[PDB]
């Protein structure tokens, strides 16, 4: 009985700020342009929605040595300010430094949990240094079910929504008592909100 608007499923779960049944081509989608990795498999997983509670997993407040409130763009707008997806966090350098990040979450919620994060493919050595300082970055996400480790593809792609870089988003199911580990020295789109199942 569940019905969307001019959000897509993606724009929905990531929490586009301009926000069964969706319109085959929605207005609001991915603010920043990119791909939502494993899209359709997720969609198949989501017609079986018996329980769906959004819960926090890593407070935005808890980022002391990176600049949290700055991941905003003239491409994800809200009330004529630059904004971004609510559920994730676009971490930017602070005092011209970007210490590697080592975060980790244990699912102690009796339930499966749907976690969403991403990587920013910036478009040149310029944007890269400006935003994250480190020229050569990685991202490393892991559980007992998943092992991802991704390098950012620095290239200037065709401008879409004002933006010559891209953002890839990934997702995973976290079983009860499994932990997920993040490690990243730049270009990380960090989860803040996840979903119960």
């Amino acid at each position: 009985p569940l019905i969307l608007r001019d959000c897509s499923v993606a724009g929905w779960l990531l929490g586009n700020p301009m926000c069964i049944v969706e319109k085959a081509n929605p207005a609001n989608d991915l603010c920043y342009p990119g791909n939502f990795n494993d899209y359709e498999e997720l969609k198949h997983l989501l017609s079986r929605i018996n329980h769906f509670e959004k819960i926090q997993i890593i407070p935005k407040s808890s980022w002391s040595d990176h600049e949290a409130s700055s991941g905003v763009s003239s491409a994800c707008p809200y009330q004529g300010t630059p904004s971004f997806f609510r559920n994730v966090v676009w971490l930017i350098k602070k005092n011209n430094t970007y210490p590697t990040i080592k975060r980790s979450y244990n699912n102690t919620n009796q339930e499966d949990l749907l976690i969403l994060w991403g990587i920013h493919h910036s478009n040149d050595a310029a944007e890269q240094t400006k935003l994250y300082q480190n020229p050569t970055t990685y991202i490393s996400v892991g559980t007992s079910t998943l092992n991802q480790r991704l390098v950012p593809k620095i290239a200037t792609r065709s401008k879409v929504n004002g933006q010559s870089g891209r953002m890839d988003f990934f997702w995973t199911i976290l079983k009860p008592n499994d932990a997920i580990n993040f490690e990243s020295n730049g270009n990380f789109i960090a989860p803040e909100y996840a979903y119960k199942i």
Partner: antibody
Amino acid sequence: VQLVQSGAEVKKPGESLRISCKGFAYSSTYFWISWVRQMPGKGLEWMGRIDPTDSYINYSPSFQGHVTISVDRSISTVYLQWSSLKASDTAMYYCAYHRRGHFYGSGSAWDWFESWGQGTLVTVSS
Amino acid sequence: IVLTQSPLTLSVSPGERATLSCRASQSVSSNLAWYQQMPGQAPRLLIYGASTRATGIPARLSGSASGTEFTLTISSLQSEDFAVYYCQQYNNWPYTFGQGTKLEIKR
């Protein structure tokens, strides 16, 4: 883990002092070793913390200048160091183990001190 | 951040019930622990997340929170329980503690 610290020290103002703390040669993973100071009779004071792995260090806004936390990842031991001690610095010094950046439940932190060292008494009179 | 513990000294018969308080200046939102210290010794964890007991800890040590009012409760005092009780917040660094509450035997 089981933290052991170096023995007790007596020194005079203006002397260098480096106390030590080992006992964590393997952990997994992401963990902080912190330094806590406890003055005779008073409560307790967090001084700073270090990741023995990538030697990342946070100092308290009360101690950034006075002291220096350090690690020789070789022998897997953490050091607290002063350049010029002071009668004020007279205290019990503990090191303590906790997890680096682990979270759980609904956003709460896994950052309580799990394991302590026995203590290192430092005295400056002099 | 400031944790204010209360009281500092508390005289209580063996058998009875003690109620230690700790109050936060800000919000620590349940990221708070209780340790116990005895003379010469390090502190040992009793309570984490304001409510959960550590392993080994009996059920007569209880912990509850009202936002910023944190409450430790010891019932049926055995001699093993007379020492100093600190609260600590690990909501963010610099981690801060209380000033202590010495639990005295009453006769």
